[PDB]
Amino acid sequence: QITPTRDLKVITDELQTLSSYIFHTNIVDDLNSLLTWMSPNDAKSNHQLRPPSLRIKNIIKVLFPGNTNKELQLQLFSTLKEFYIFQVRYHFFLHFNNINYLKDIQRWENYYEFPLRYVPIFDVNVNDWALELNSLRHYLLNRNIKFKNNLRTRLDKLIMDDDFDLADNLIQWLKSANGSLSSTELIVNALYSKINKFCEDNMSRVWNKRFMIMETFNKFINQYWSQFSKLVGCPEDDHELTTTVFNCFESNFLRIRTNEIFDICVLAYPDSKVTLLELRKIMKDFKDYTNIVTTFLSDFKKYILNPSVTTVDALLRYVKTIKAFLVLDPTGRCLHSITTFVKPYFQERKHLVNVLLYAMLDLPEEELKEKINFNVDMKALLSLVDTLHDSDIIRHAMLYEHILNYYIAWVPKSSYIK
Amino acid sequence: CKVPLAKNRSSKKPSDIYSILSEIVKSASGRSLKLNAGLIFSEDKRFTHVV
Amino acid sequence: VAFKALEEDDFLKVKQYLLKSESLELDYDQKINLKYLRVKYLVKIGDYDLSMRLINQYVKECCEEVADSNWRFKFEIESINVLLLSDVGIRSLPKIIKLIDEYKEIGNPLRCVILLLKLCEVLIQVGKSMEAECLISCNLSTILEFPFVRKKTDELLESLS
Amino acid sequence: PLRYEPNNRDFACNIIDDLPKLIRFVKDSKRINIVPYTQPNSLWRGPDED
Amino acid sequence: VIREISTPCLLPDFSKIKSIRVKMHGYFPLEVNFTKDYSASDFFSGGTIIYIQRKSESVFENKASFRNVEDIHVALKRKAAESKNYSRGNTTSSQLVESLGIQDLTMVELDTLLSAALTDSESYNLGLLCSDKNSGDILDCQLELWYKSFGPH
């Protein structure tokens, strides 16, 4: 995209000489009047967003109603293009440091292109006017850091507020500019932020539902996928993109549940136990287990291991967590790790042995009250009892078949994890 | 003709004075293959079953 | 003595010593110092076409023959000085950055600070000294801890004024 | 609580952490023993396990 | 017949192999063809392991324009991968150099050079760079020299 420049003075003199020779009339003063009108450098003689008078329009009609005259007109048009190109960049450079927002550039674009409607100089088949404006946009992107940062913030704000049409207008402006801030990174970041907030809004504090990640993914798709596909321009049926979006949703769901696992296991159980089964379908790596247990132990000890908490409720919540994690983890290795971390605190409390064995044998409260000097919560006692009592935790032809069905059908610190 | 082997730039607790000295005096007096094996075969529990 | 002579601008004495260098039998550790001494001397004279071809050969052979990372660092920054001194330090931006983050992990503060000054110096010969002043202001506290860089650090301050 | 987030503009690297931590000499009745150094006020200021 | 396998897999006999190539998003591809002069056995005689060089996602690589296609799916995958580490900001030196506004190596250098002159030899030099057959931020260079030549002063 090489553009030539031949100085303001030279082209002005060339324009004056050509007009004087071709027209043989004193339109040079008028020609000076028009060029000032198209020139944005002088704010007094230009348009100032005002339509021209009859004089300007008539002269344009004269300019735009043999071969030597035709080519002379062609160089005159080329010289006018150079002058207009010269004027716009100089004006743009005069106000280059004054640009801090997108709305500034369109109003300047409108400011520059206001005379363009009244005087046609740009060929329809040649998108020259687009070329230099894209060139200036590319430069503004690649020279003005604060403008680049403002665009990032503006696009992020617009996509947070569901201002989709303007966001699309922003993106086309970016792809037209072809600057160092490619739209692909922006919409990825905008999409990633939007899905996270939507996930935070929807799948927080709710655990009693089943296959709810399907519901949230479906709800989000119905609400924004068409707009997002329009923004990107990719076909609506992009399978791989939807799969990656789904993979991010479940990753977010894993992250939130890890953060909330304490309240999930302590309070919401057993009502949230269904979510635990859904969680069991998701965790696959050792790091996930370690993060879950270290987070769970952190919150548990922060709240439960206070000696200020009643020992009866402490054990009651403790066993509630044990069964919850056992349902979550059939192996029970996490239970062992939780166990090994928590026992010294249990030995710290003194009445734990008596009350627990009495809970084991379901002793009546009267015997408890005879020799125990601290109140024991009866509704806790019944609840722990109910949890404790929860118990949801031909003869020759078959030998040929079973020997094939059992031996050919290939099935693909101690144990302490009973 | 120079088979320059690439030195593995491996890289956390700094510990204390005594622990380091105890370590050195204490030290004074296949794993990769198996680690590969867990990667050479994967995506199933067949190898453990056959062993 | 030669290094002190270089500091006191006694070019005649150091020049005579380099003549002894090429025909002496020297230990490797000694060899590097004289090898490092020569490049520093050539910088002061002003000829950089010879030194630039000379410094790169040294560092290239300072990584294959002997894996001396410390002497590699000292040679690299000399080349950085040669470039920015010739009003073109922008070529060194890829080189300086790759060392910064590399030594951030290592954690040697002296390495981290020296590259900061070089980074500051390149930014001021661009015409963007505004942000260079902003960066140096925040880090001024931790760069005065090292003595021998203070002379360079102080001198840059009057330049900003 | 101080929040000292890592910033590129902060090149003020720390070396005390790289240096090995000091220790203390305390002698009991049986013999002279060696313990890791703790600041006199570190017991109530140390990073909680909790 | 093209045979696609995972990394820790037992390739067939070396003498029957004609070429092998590695392609994956990230590390730039490496493809070697075995002619009659050298067999795979001789190539792997020193060792059965071949090393690959890392590609670089450097800010300096993308001065003004992106030659990279930057597909939406891989970009989303990379952001998700980065967020996984982040879950497990201006903390990177590349952001620092981005904040400094000195990403464009050439544009910065010429701005320093044009600061003042415009000697004929150097003037033709910048013009030669402006009219380069192939380069990057050519329009940026063209538009600076226009600013220097006929801009405010």
Distance from CA of B4 to the nearest CA of C (A): 9
Distance from CA of B13 to the nearest CA of D (A): 9
Q: Quick count: other Cβ atoms within 10 Å of Cβ A401? A: 9
* Residues of chain E found within 8 Å of residue A2, distances taken between Cβ atoms: 130-131, 138, 142
How far is CA C78 from each of CA A150, A397, A405, C17, C152, rounded to the nearest angstrom?
A: 39, 88, 76, 21, 15
DSSP string, B26-49: HHH--HHHHHHHHHHS-SSSHHHH
How far is CA A343 from each of CA A318, A414, E7, E16, rounded to the nearest angstrom?
A: 11, 18, 46, 63
Alpha helices in A221-373 (DSSP H): 226-232, 239-259, 261-266, 273-280, 286-303, 311-328, 333-348, 352-361, 365-371
Q: Which residues of B9-47 are buried (b: 16+ CB within 10 A; e: fewer)?
A: eeeeeeebebeeeeeeeeeeeeeeeeeeeeeeeeeeeee
**In which residue are the tokens 């004279």 written?**
C45
Rounded Cα–Cα distance for residues A7 and A15 (Å): 12
* Cβ pair A411:B49 closer than 8 A: yes
Nearest by Cα to A3 from A111, A102, A86, A114: A86
Cβ-in-10-Å burial (0-12, 13-18, 19+) of E151 comes to: middle
Q: Quick count: other Cβ atoms within 10 Å of Cβ A56? A: 19
Q: Do E56 and C98 contact (CB within 8 A), yes or no?
A: no
Rounded Cα–Cα distance for residues A322 and A325 (Å): 5
* Cβ pair C113:D14 closer than 8 A: no
How far is CA C131 from each of CA C82, C123, C124, C136, C155, rounded to the nearest angstrom?
A: 23, 8, 9, 8, 18
A89: nearest CB among E77, E130, E146: E146
What sign does the dihedral A115-A120-A121-A123 (CA atoms) show?
positive
* Residues of chain D found within 8 Å of residue C112, distances taken between Cβ atoms: 11, 13
Q: Do E58 and E84 contact (CB within 8 A), yes or no?
A: no
Angle between helices C150-160 and C109-124 (to 10 degrees): 30
Tokens of A383: 């609840």
**In which residue are the tokens 């040679």 written?**
C75
Distance from CA of D47 to the nearest CA of A (A): 14
Distance from CA of B20 to the nearest CA of C (A): 21
Q: Name residues whose C-beta falls within 8 Å of residue C24's C-beta, 6 or more positions apart in sequence.
A: none
Q: Which method was it determined by?
A: cryo-EM
A210 touches chain D (CB under 8 A): no
Rounded Cα–Cα distance for residues A86 and A92 (Å): 10
Rounded Cα–Cα distance for residues E109 and E144 (Å): 11
Q: Please identify among residues 64-83 of chain E the ones whose CB lies closer than 8 Å to any CB of chain C.
A: none
E92 touches chain D (CB under 8 A): yes
Q: Name residues whose C-beta falls within 8 Å of residue A36's C-beta, 6 or more positions apart in sequence.
A: A42, A45, A46
Q: After which residues does chain D break, using C–N > 2.5 Å?
A: none
Nearest by Cα to A5 from A170, A135, A194, A125: A135
* Residues of chain E found within 8 Å of residue D9, distances taken between Cβ atoms: 96
Element holding D23 (H helix, E strand)? strand D23-27
Rounded Cα–Cα distance for residues A248 and A254 (Å): 10
Q: Do C5 and C13 contact (CB within 8 A), yes or no?
A: yes
Tell how far CA E75 is from the center of its chain: 16
8-state DSSP, A222: I
Rounded Cα–Cα distance for residues C39 and C51 (Å): 6
Name the β-bridge partners of E33.
E19
Nearest by Cα to A133 from A153, A162, A113, A163: A113
Chains touching D by CB (3 or more pairs below 8 Å)? A, B, C, E
* Cβ pair D11:C141 closer than 8 A: no
- Count of CA atoms in the C-beta half-sphere (13 A) of C65: 10
Q: Name residues whose C-beta falls within 8 Å of residue C92's C-beta, 6 or more positions apart in sequence.
A: C79, C80, C83, C84, C118, C122
Tokens of D21: 């931590």
Rounded Cα–Cα distance for residues E43 and E34 (Å): 9
Tokens of C149: 């860089």
Q: Which residues of E98-109 are buried (b: 16+ CB within 10 A; e: fewer)?
A: bbbbbbbbbbbb
D10 touches chain C (CB under 8 A): yes
Q: Can you tell me whether residue C49 is helix, strand or coil?
A: helix
Q: Do A192 and A246 contact (CB within 8 A), yes or no?
A: no
Nearest by Cα to E145 from E120, E126, E124: E126
D5 touches chain C (CB under 8 A): no
What sign does the dihedral C148-C151-C154-C156 (CA atoms) show?
negative
**In which residue are the tokens 């039998």 written?**
C25
E108: nearest CB among C90, C101, C131: C90
Nearest by Cα to A292 from A256, A248, A267, A319: A256
C65 touches chain B (CB under 8 A): no
Q: Do A180 and E63 contact (CB within 8 A), yes or no?
A: yes
Name the β-bridge partners of D33.
D26
Tokens of A304: 């439960």
* Cβ pair A410:B46 closer than 8 A: yes
Does residue A51 have a cis bond before it (omega within 30 degrees)? no
Q: Please identify among residues 269-288 of chain A the ones whose CB lies closer than 8 Å to any CB of chain E.
A: 287
Element holding D27 (H helix, E strand)? strand D23-27
Q: Do A417 and A333 contact (CB within 8 A), yes or no?
A: yes
Tokens of A224: 């924004």
The CA-CA-CA angle for residues A9, A11, A16, to 5°, reads 95
* Cβ pair D23:B14 closer than 8 A: no
Q: Name residues whose C-beta falls within 8 Å of residue C68's C-beta, 6 or more positions apart in sequence.
A: C32, C62
Q: Can you tell me whether residue E21 is helix, strand or coil?
A: strand
The CA-CA-CA angle for residues A168, A171, A176, to 5°, reads 125
* Residues of chain D found within 8 Å of residue A302, distances taken between Cβ atoms: 50
* Cβ pair E143:A232 closer than 8 A: no
Q: Quick count: other Cβ atoms within 10 Å of Cβ E36? A: 6
* Cβ pair E51:B39 closer than 8 A: no
Q: Can you tell me whether residue D32 is helix, strand or coil?
A: strand
Q: Name residues whose C-beta falls within 8 Å of residue A15's C-beta, 6 or more positions apart in sequence.
A: A31, A35, A76, A79, A80, A83
Tell how far CA C98 is from the center of its chain: 16
Phi–psi pair at D33, nearest 5 degrees = -115, 165
E60: nearest CB among C87, C94, C104: C94
DSSP string, C104-160: HHHT-HHHHHHHHHHHHHHHHTTT-HHHHHHHHHHHHHHHTTSSTTHHHHHHHHHHH
Residue of chain C nearest B4, judged by CA positions = C64
Nearest by Cα to A46 from A1, A130, A113: A113
How far is CA A372 from each of CA A318, A348, A354, C122, E24, rounded to the nearest angstrom?
A: 22, 18, 9, 79, 70
Nearest by Cα to A175 from A167, A166, A184: A184
Phi–psi pair at C47, nearest 5 degrees = -70, 120
Distance from CA of B16 to the nearest CA of E (A): 28
* Cβ pair A410:B45 closer than 8 A: no
Q: How many CB pairs below 8 Å do chains C and D form together?
A: 25
